[PDB]
């Protein structure tokens with residue numbers, strides 16, 4: 001999922017954009033991916049309980 | 050006038066008109082690329098008169 | 099051949115050209131124009 005950025009694949013976005021404008025999009029990717037991981041870990045905790 | 054800085058760098062150089070718009074972090078141009086590149090995490094001011 | 103043309107068509111009829119099967123080195127693009135605005139959106143001009 002692009003998560004509202006240019007692309008959903010880091011190894012392309014890092015080479016298509018320079019750092020001082022790419023950090024925003026990579027931060028969007030980080031926040032989306034980590035929110036998804038938080039959802040996954042919470043659901044796993046509930047299932048484990 | 051309310052802040053305490055460790056050290057201050059004062060770099061002075063006379064340049065053209067459009068080159069004032071050229072100078073900024075994450076910029077480009079004949080001067081911003083081979084004559085003066087500001088740091089990407091620049092924390093300061095540029096003065097042009 | 100697209101940066102020193104002489105009759106860039108009016109905005110109401112915007113000339114559109116297709117460029118393919120060549121090697122793009124935009125140094126000619128920089129040195130052919132005293133740039134005033136280079137606002138790129140999908141890709142940064144630096145690593146272009």
Ligand SMILES: *[C@@H]1O[C@H](CO)[C@@H](O)[C@H](O)[C@H]1NC(C)=O
Pocket residue numbers: 102103104
């Ligand atoms: C090609 O570029 C040069 C350099 O600016 C310009 O003098 C010349 O007029 C251009 N060619 C044409 C056909 O305009």
